[PDB]
Amino acid sequence: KNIDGYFKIYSKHTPINLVRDLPQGFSALEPLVDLPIGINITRFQTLL
Amino acid sequence: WNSNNLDSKGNYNYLYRLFRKSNLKPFERDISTEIYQAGSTPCNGVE
């Protein structure tokens, strides 16, 4: 999320067992970084 | 501070936006080269 010049990140590297979709469960996501480049990205593309 | 004694020689390289279809939000930079269209007919990018 981009707020006040800050793109932000939150992550959990966490195991699951499911093929289909999000497994049900609850894990909070702590921040990792926040680069305030101030570049609104109304769109984005993953890289595979 | 004044740039009149340096930047002014005048100086066309310092530019401003004479028209925008709205008023900017905080720290919102409009870099779009789109012409300002005051008519209903498409400007098609040309004046």
Q: Measured between beta carbons, which residues in chain A are less than 8 angstroms from residue B27?
A: 5, 38
Exposure of A34 in the CB half-sphere (CA atoms within 13 A):
10
Q: Which two tokens stand for residue A20?
A: 């289909």
β pairing state of A10-11 and A30-31: antiparallel
- Cβ–Cβ < 8 Å for A8, A1: yes
CB B47 within 8 A of CB B35: yes
- Chain B residue numbers with beta carbons less than 8 Å from the beta carbon of A38 are 27
Closest to A2 in 3D by CA, of A40, A32, A30, A31: A40
Q: How far is A36 from chain B (nearest CA, A)?
A: 12
